[PDB]
Amino acid sequence: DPDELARRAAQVIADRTGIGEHDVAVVLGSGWLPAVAALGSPTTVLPQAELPGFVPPTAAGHAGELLSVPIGAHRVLVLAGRIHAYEGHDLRYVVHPVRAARAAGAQIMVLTNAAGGLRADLQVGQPVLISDHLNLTARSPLVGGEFVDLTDAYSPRLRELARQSDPQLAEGVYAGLPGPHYETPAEIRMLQTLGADLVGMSTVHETIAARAAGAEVLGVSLVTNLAAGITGEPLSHAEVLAAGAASATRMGALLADVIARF
Amino acid sequence: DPDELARRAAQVIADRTGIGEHDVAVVLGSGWLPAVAALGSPTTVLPQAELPGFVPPTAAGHAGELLSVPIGAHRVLVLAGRIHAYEGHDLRYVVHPVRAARAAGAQIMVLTNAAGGLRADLQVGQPVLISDHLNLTARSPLVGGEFVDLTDAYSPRLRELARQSDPQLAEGVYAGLPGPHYETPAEIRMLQTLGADLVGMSTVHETIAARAAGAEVLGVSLVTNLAAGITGEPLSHAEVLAAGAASATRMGALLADVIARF
Amino acid sequence: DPDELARRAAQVIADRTGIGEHDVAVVLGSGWLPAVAALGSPTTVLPQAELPGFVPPTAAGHAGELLSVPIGAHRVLVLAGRIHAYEGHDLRYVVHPVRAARAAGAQIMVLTNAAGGLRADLQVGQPVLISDHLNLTARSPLVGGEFVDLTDAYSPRLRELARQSDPQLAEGVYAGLPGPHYETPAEIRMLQTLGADLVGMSTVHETIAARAAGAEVLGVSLVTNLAAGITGEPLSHAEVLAAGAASATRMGALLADVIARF
């Protein structure tokens, strides 16, 4: 039962942070690890693994920590690192962090990730707001009778607030694939034909779960590389992390400022 | 064993209805529940849960009953309600009803469903004959060695008979997705590029199983809403059922008239 | 563990063939069974079922044997027949043959298969080099941390060598689907829009596993039929095998000559 698991996790979060309720939750993805400090000074930092239902993150660049940080007038839950479907876990565990955050009081989820850029105007190191997504996993974190509407899944309101922080920000459609292998050039051309501007291996299910649980979502992708075949250069996870690190300053600053505007 | 479980179901059906063999089978989908009255008067009504191999339907608007109704010169098996892949059951259970119907003698399957409309001409409340489908579930109810040809999976002959009943009936390509979450506007634009005119969360596997079993198929979608992003308005299951109810009488009358022409 | 099972299978291969190491591996797919003779005179022939981790092939036209054949200056492992995902096995077993071959020393994998033709200039009986693929199975044979780059997954270098044998060889993008049901005409139109020139039910995962393991790949499809909807004619596995048999002479000769050029 996802509901009870989330409640139990939320209770532990309240007991360890000393805060009965949090207002916003942020998940830092690949390349986003160094952006955690700019969010503010944490009042609590603990291992995600400590929390009920939390499968510890294992991918490089994912700290696997939970931080409670005051940002603006909000108490923010920072999920430094996430698990992915390609790691083999049931989607119940993949979306648990977001559900636990919701049970802890968070009504706004800021989901960040690294992504390959498909639209010609996107450059490596550029943060892109997610306007919508393409779930190409043939799966759903929802089960039986949960008919959730995904119109405005990525709140236009939150994207406008983000632009208030940095009017420069572009938007794009995120394609969520299973992974863990990167795409072939032909698959990238296919994704372009399908309307995708960004490609990654997470987020879509978490967004679906967040909406199903009544929370708004702000998605932010960091273009860590141009999609396969666009340049012809080889992609590697280390390169993804390195690319993300180069924009850590802007990223951390952006998150801190936008969240304060919520 | 699928075949043997289908035979057991067909036998219980014969015993309970007192009819040794049926000629046509109809599966009523979301919103079609109240269309049963217009089909004719049942000689027998029983719970699907009482039939071997039948996983009971659980989605709202799915009665989970089996009726034996005489329509014209045919003895018709009416499967009021169905189970869906999003309910978590293996496909053998999802296509079992159709296989049991075939074992009961049904050589024609009338698969009805609710669907979101993507093509510009479609209106809410409009019945649409399925001309072909797009299986976007990445699954199949068939196993090794079952290399079934899907050309004319939706019998042109039956669509021809349907138009004889209502000359104004339009046709469309149905895209079958996993569900249970509705599609994002971006996914809808993607489906239009893929050639989809209607979008749903059932039917495709049942059609495949029916063809593999040697039965002809007539697919009928009731546009219960325009696809996500077309109107921007929210989608909800209650609304799907409500829309279906507004057209239930017409749908039942249509089915009765078409089937009598078989 | 996949790697351990692979190394173990490789030790058995070495022992039963008396050959401590092989240089090239070739997988013969549907319709390719008779092309084995032209490869050369085998020094050892044994059932795949007798090797660790090898699930026996079951589809008609797949011998299920492993042959050690000297071709040119190379010691070649010939996998006569393969298993498919539609047979229900975990992808670990589907890609095991390739991983075992790599562990046995093979740094080049020649993956052959039967495929439906989508591009208008491709004819039944025509061999087509795979330039790239579209993995439309929503799956991957890899697990967490195995972020493999798939640029040039099908070695341009090996395709060049292939053309030195037959300068008239055409290239095409292969779409890998789950199967086992054949595609609907609407699905074929979709595949064309997605950039597919060939459609099949294997190879993509084996290619991914090969690349992840450090082996180059040469993919060769034999157009055994025009895709569904192109002609309207019925498709069947027997016809696929018959079509393949009609070009077995050309294929066996092609394989023997190309491998000798490696």
Ligand SMILES: O=c1[nH]cnc2c(C[N@@H+]3C[C@H](CO)[C@@H](O)C3)c[nH]c12
């Ligand atoms: O080109 C790409 N294709 C698919 N995903 C990504 C990502 C995103 N994350 C990064 C990480 C792999 O390096 C995995 O969890 C996917 C960055 N670039 C790409």
Ligand SMILES: O=c1[nH]cnc2c(C[N@@H+]3C[C@H](CO)[C@@H](O)C3)c[nH]c12
């Ligand atoms: O817009 C749509 N997208 C996907 N499926 C449907 C359906 C069909 N059924 C209806 C039902 C959900 O309300 C589920 O079993 C899917 C109607 N409208 C849509």
Ligand SMILES: O=c1[nH]cnc2c(C[N@@H+]3C[C@H](CO)[C@@H](O)C3)c[nH]c12
């Ligand atoms: O039209 C086609 N669609 C999908 N696969 C194939 C193939 C390839 N193999 C052949 C075999 C089925 O007959 C199965 O393992 C798929 C040949 N023609 C087609």
